[PDB]
Amino acid sequence: MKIYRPLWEDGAFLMPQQFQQQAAWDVHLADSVARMGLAHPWGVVAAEFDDSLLPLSRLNATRLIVRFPDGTLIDTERADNLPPVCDLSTVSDRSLVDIVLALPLLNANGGNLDNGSESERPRRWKSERVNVQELAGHEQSEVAVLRHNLTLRMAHQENAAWLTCPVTRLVRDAQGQWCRDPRFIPPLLTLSASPSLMTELLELLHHLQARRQRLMSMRRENNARLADFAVADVSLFWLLNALNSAEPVLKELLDMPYRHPELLYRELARLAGSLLTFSLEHNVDAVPAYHHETPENVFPPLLSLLNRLLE
């Protein structure tokens, strides 16, 4: 699927595949702007759900901000509307249920709009009679507006002509009523999209500063006696090096928690390599490789490793 810059003549014929091949170039420009420091297929900001219907087998999404691997921003406060209600009575199981958010694959060669009742999947909806007030002072009017054709899926079906971006995970409680898993991390894009990770990092920081303060209290003002410095104080400066040269970066990153996770990984995996030489009798590289859209295998292994190695 190539993109053609249309040519604006004068005294010619206008056709809508000048407008469309104009509009689809700027998104491809912003993709290559974004891919110059960051290097992953991006994910979820701020998913929120409803829980009232959960005694029955019914869900209801409320607010989504989702970005797919082709630079397609899905917003529900401004751009789009809410995807409809999925029905969960088609699963009798009590085991893991993973709800992914799915978008139809973009067309190749003709026919992509949700008028026409023949059973084909790749569609983008059309909403009409939307009264839009112009920003000149005049009245409103009925326009046509593009709506994406979103829906929720089950991730154990066959997803071959859709896109996959995981959202939530359900485990049935022991009394039969459905409850949401408190430990599930979608592929992140901003750290304020999953609060339990923020809870664990806030606990990490106050875990850290008291380990710093006991070591600062174990330093008298007599820095002269080498004999009492050669045994009980000959590794304390090695440890204060690591705890002093990685705190203000980490505090900076958790002041305003609005950034991509690669920055945070590039600090935690820097501190964990420095605090591994002190107790280097265990495995030489247990630090997990960040290659993931699945952060459950990533960040609770690092926080458990640092919570051990501060000892």
Add this chain to the structure above:
Amino acid sequence: MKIYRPLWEDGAFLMPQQFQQQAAWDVHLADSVARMGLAHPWGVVAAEFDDSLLPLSRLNATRLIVRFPDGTLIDTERADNLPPVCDLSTVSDRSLVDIVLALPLLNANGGNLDNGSESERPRRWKSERVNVQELAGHEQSEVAVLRHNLTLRMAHQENAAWLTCPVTRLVRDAQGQWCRDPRFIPPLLTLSASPSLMTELLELLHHLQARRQRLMSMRRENNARLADFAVADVSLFWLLNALNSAEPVLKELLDMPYRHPELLYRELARLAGSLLTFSLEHNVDAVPAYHHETPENVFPPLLSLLNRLLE
């Protein structure tokens, strides 16, 4: 503000709101592609004023390239209109005065301007007729264009439906004469907007290499055949290990000062943290290298700290 997106098909037809929303959508993507330019908010890259108009108690701008928090970028060398004269002849009390660059808030039901004498709410979007050279051709036809409504206001008046960003202070010299403040780092910085800091960063970088050659030369008699431990021959090598891994990086953050200063926070803070442990008997901890609207309390205390702590 419900930024819609239009739909161009074979029956869709031409409206102004077809184009206005498509204009707003790619403005809105420019914030979503910033994961550090959302960390610190929107900034200021150039602001230059005149002093000869001050004995007449006038004030006039020359160059203003300011990012505003809504995503709107202002540039008086690529847009054209400059803000008019700021009449100072209402301030009797000769204390200090701050100056902000206003911009009226977007009414989502009003609009542009027609002749100004219509309402009591100040409005953006002033019109203009400019002879435009058509590219790829030989025409020069008149196209109505867009130029924003910018006024210079004081930061103490009855704030109203307008955004702000400060540009300068006004101290009062003892001759009854206004002048400009020499210490005021302009708020919401983007590095090269204030030339005074760049000089002090140059002096700091040279002052590091002033100490480093002495610390290098004092070791050159040791023949690289050490004892197992000595009382200073471990405290000698920390001041080399804390400079020889922050000199060639801080060198490269200073040759090209066209870069966000948040990357400079994190590279001075590590150098400060690696030297607080090197000499402390006073419980003195580092200044917080957080972005703010007031960078007067981030960089000048850090520059006071680093000259002292290196020696």
Add this chain to the structure above:
Amino acid sequence: MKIYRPLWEDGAFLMPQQFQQQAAWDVHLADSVARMGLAHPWGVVAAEFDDSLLPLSRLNATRLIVRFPDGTLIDTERADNLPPVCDLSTVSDRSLVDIVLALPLLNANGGNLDNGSESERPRRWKSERVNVQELAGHEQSEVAVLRHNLTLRMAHQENAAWLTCPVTRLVRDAQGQWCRDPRFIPPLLTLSASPSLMTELLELLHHLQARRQRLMSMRRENNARLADFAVADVSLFWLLNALNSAEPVLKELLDMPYRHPELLYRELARLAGSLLTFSLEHNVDAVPAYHHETPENVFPPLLSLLNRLLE
């Protein structure tokens, strides 16, 4: 230069000067986003040739994706063409032959190329007609698009065209066989544009891991000597805290070969600068600066420094 964003309201004729200016403003926004981080005259992305014709001295380009120091994205997948090089033995030497990409300068009045009106200033636009459909429907029609003008001049002819970007370096073998040497490096937006930095990074990481595991095995002899340190154990702790904090960042920055090379260079500078002090009886403190115009003056000397200092 001047950029004139149009006003949109219910009066204006549908004049072509609106769309060219409105599309020109979005490139300026998308470049001011990209200058929040990096600082660069843009580099190549992919450049791959065909060594079949080379016994007949004709060179062709299968795929090229570059950028240009004004911010103009060139792809040879969409918006493509390229003429071959006619002769090569017009130069009678091998070491001087190198090929560049050229996109002629901007004429601020005229424009595209529609006839044989060959001036002293070339053009850089064209026209073309191709078959385009995307919309709601299945019918394809034909509309006229805008394609760039590229050519492969050599390094030493002239510079009234653009070039400023080398792509290869042709040298002969003694049997009259022009062939590309591996030691050539264009200015790089991404890694893996040059296929032979990546092998000489993988050998770096392989030799780093062995000289970490060697001293970790010595440390497993030194677990009998934890509280019994010597000069070997103290300098071993220095060297081990050099290596362990900087391996896991490098295993990240060799499995994402899609990033800007500034991030690789900033960490390799720290890894080089940490280990200077141990053989500054053999060397000096000269570390190569960063130079985004010929990167082959930077990276192989630093990578040959490191394999000497780790041994």
Add this chain to the structure above:
Amino acid sequence: HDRRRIPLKTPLTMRVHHPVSLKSRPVMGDHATDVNSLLPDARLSCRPAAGSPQLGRTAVMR
């Protein structure tokens, strides 16, 4: 076929209309299209012209 030009349409119609507008085929700029010697010189009243051209008067060479 002959590449004709003007006939200038009396409303310009490419005012981008807010209340009522239509697209499907009729879109343009301001001028459409419609696909479907030995001669003397500047003497008096009436026979100067060879109609629209005027040549055959300064080949003094070859």
